[PDB]
Amino acid sequence: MYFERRPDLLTKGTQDKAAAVKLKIENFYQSSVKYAIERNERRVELETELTSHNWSEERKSRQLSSLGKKESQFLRLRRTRLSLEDFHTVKVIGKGAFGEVRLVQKKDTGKIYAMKTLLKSEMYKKSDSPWVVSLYYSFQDAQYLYLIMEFLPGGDLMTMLIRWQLFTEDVTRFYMAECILAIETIHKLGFIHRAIKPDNILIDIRGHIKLSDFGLSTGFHKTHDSNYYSISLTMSNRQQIQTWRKSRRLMAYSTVGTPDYIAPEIFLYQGYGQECDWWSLGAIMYECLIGWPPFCSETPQETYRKIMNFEQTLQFPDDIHISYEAEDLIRRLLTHADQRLGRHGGADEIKSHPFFRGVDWNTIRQVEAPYIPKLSSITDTRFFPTDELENVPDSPAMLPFIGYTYSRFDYLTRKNAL
Amino acid sequence: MFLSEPFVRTALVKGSFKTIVQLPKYVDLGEWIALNVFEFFTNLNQFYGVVAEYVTPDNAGPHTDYLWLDANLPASQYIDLALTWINNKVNDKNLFPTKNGLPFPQQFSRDVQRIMVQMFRIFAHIYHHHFDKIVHLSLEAHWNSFFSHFISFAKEFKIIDRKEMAPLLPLIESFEKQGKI
Amino acid sequence: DFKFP
Numbered sequence: 001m002y003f004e005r006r007p008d009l010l011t012k013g014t015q016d017k018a019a020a021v022k023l024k025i026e027n028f029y030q031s032s033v034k035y036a037i038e039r040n041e042r043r044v045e046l047e048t049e050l051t052s053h054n055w056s057e058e059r060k061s062r063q064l065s066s067l068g069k070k071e072s073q074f075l076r077l078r079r080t081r082l083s084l085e086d087f088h089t090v091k092v093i094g095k096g097a098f099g100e101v102r103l104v105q106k107k108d109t110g111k112i113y114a115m116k117t118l119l120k121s122e123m124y125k126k127s128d129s130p131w132v133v134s135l136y137y138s139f140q141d142a143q144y145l146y147l148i149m150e151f152l153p154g155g156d157l158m159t160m161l162i163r164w165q166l167f168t169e170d171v172t173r174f175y176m177a178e179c180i181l182a183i184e185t186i187h188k189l190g191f192i193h194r195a196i197k198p199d200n201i202l203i204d205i206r207g208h209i210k211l212s213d214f215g216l217s218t219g220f221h222k223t224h225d226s227n228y229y230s231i232s233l234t235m236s237n238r239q240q241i242q243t244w245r246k247s248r249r250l251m252a253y254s255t256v257g258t259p260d261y262i263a264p265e266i267f268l269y270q271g272y273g274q275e276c277d278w279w280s281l282g283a284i285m286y287e288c289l290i291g292w293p294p295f296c297s298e299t300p301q302e303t304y305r306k307i308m309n310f311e312q313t314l315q316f317p318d319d320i321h322i323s324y325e326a327e328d329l330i331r332r333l334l335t336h337a338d339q340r341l342g343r344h345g346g347a348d349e350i351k352s353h354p355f356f357r358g359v360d361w362n363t364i365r366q367v368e369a370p371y372i373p374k375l376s377s378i379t380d381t382r383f384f385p386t387d388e389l390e391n392v393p394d395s396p397a398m399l400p401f402i403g404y405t406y407s408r409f410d411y412l413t414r415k416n417a418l
Numbered sequence: 419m420f421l422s423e424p425f426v427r428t429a430l431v432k433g434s435f436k437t438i439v440q441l442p443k444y445v446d447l448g449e450w451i452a453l454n455v456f457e458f459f460t461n462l463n464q465f466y467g468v469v470a471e472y473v474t475p476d477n478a479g480p481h482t483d484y485l486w487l488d489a490n491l492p493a494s495q496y497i498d499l500a501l502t503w504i505n506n507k508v509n510d511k512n513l514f515p516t517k518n519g520l521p522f523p524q525q526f527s528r529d530v531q532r533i534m535v536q537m538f539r540i541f542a543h544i545y546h547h548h549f550d551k552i553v554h555l556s557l558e559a560h561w562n563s564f565f566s567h568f569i570s571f572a573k574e575f576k577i578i579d580r581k582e583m584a585p586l587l588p589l590i591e592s593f594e595k596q597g598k599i
Numbered sequence: 600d601f602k603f604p
């Protein structure tokens with residue numbers, strides 16, 4: 001039947017549904033081969049080591065069964081599909097603009113995970129280190145996107161800074177040094193976080209600090225500018241404890257991503273570098289020592305203006321509390337990018353400032369932290385502003401989605417904790 | 419139809435299936451099967467899904483038909499029936515427990531054949547009725563290999579018997595150059 | 600209270 005063929009009247013729901021199948025089948029068999037090819041590979045890896053130690057035949061056929069014990073569980077995994085109702089919600093924890101964050105127990109077993117809820121079609125964009133929150137796996141549905149992370153009961157640094165309103169130079173030295181070491185590590189993996197800020201900073205069971213993210217898919221960008229162009233009633237330290245209070249009671253949820261802690265050269269063109277995140281550190285350091293961030297303003301545009309003319313907008317109040325090495329550090333972190341501390345082969349050029357003489361930077365993780373969260377269970381939301389606002393103008397109103405066809409390697413690591 | 423043209427060159431078969439279909443060493447046969455059964459169905463159902471648009475009254479192939487009228491159907495009917503039947507037998511956490519250490523039922527190997535055969539029912543329903551327009555968009559190397567896979571597994575572990583292949587018994591032997599005797 | 604040198 002030496003024949004031929006042509007398009008014309010396959011109604012574009014069965015035209016491009018063939019472009020999909022061709023893609024599906026190639027990636028399929030390409031991978032069915034890879035899978036089997038490593039299935040084989042690691043099997044013969046253990047069998048070259050069971051006869052590399054002169055072991056008993058009872059022993060090898062326990063190790064060998066332990067191997068396939070694993071192997072079987074893997075294929076059991078990919079077969080798994082889950083959604084909600086495989087999770088039970090405990091309490092709501094936070095809200096960004098895109099979606100909230102949830103303390104979750106998995107009905108299936110029952111653990112403490114962190115659920116981050118997000119929104120496809122609204123985020124356009126069209127590993128394993130002590131210092132950053134652990135992401136395990138993720139699964140999708142029709143409208144939102146779901147991520148599974150360990151839950152940090154320490155609250156956030158924003159929520160800390162409220163409860164204490166002011167850190168000492170010793171509290172702060174600790175928490176700063178912690179941030180350096182988190183930030184250092186992120187940079188060493190060739191990333192810039194570009195979203196360092198109080199609420200983006202998290203506390204574990206032992207009062208220690210870790211980052212939560214890396215600055216890929218958190219949020220938005222800045223409008224690059226805009227233009228607007230009487231009896232006083234104020235006492236001016238109160239003046240911020242007044243404005244700030246409006247930047248959480250009506251801005252934590254449905255946030256904007258406040259420009260404090262945003263270094264200057266970002267509002268300019270794309271011209272920035274790893275140094276970008278050290279500014280925000282100095283921003284932060286300032287905040288906990290003084291009582292607000294350096295450029296805190298009535299409105300965020302005003303804040304833009306200050307950062308841009310920062311050389312005359314940075315001033316330390318007359319509430320003394322700040323040594324000659326504290327004040328120096330913030331200043332050498334809150335300057336021009338190519339000049340800033342931690343720019344020149346830095347990130348430990350910071351550690352050598354005389355505001356530390358710090359711990360060996362080794363034992364730092366083993367040390368009594370200024371506040372160990374006093375916890376009452378494994379589901380203690382006590383450290384969270386568990387008040388509820390719940391206004392997300394998405395409202396689309398009224399076991400799908402196989403969560404993984406992963407690789408073996410991620411199966412081990414995620415099994416070695418889950 | 420006349421499905422033995424000079425096209426039996428079946429690309430994407432550059433091996434012989436004894437490397438991805440043989441049970442891997444030290445692997446629960448249930449897992450090794452309950453995966454592929456999931457796998458097979460999930461891909462088969464993208465095949466009738468690129469064709470479901472056009473399936474309308476005129477059942478099954480010649481000399482032997484799959485009556486869905488058998489106890490208390492046209493082409494599109496008993497496909498969206500048997501197809502949907504599979505989906506549910508496979509997402510059943512009883513026969514197909516996604517939970518970690520649940521053992522496979524006694525029903526398990528039985529339902530395996532059941533799910534297997536009804537797939538072939540929809541496998542074959544595609545190979546006699548709607549197999550014509552396949553050659554339009556250059557997907558023969560695909561369905562050739564994929565069929566060359568569905569049998570191979572079913573033969574290696576013998577969840578289908580010899581007599582049920584009469585609807586395609588001549589085409590099986592056509593592909594016994596990548597067929598794992 | 601706390602002290603971190």
Ligand SMILES: Nc1ncnc2c1ncn2[C@@H]1O[C@H](COP(=O)(O)OP(=O)(O)NP(=O)(O)O)[C@@H](O)[C@H]1O
Pocket residue numbers: 093094095096097098101114116133149150151152153155156158199200201202212218219255257384
């Ligand atoms: N792993 C976590 N464990 C506990 N609480 C968390 C965790 N991740 C986030 N949160 C809470 O949610 C806040 C951070 O939410 P986040 O996901 O950063 O919102 P966002 O709008 O996407 N980015 P941003 O709001 O600018 O921080 C923290 O201040 C906590 O209150």
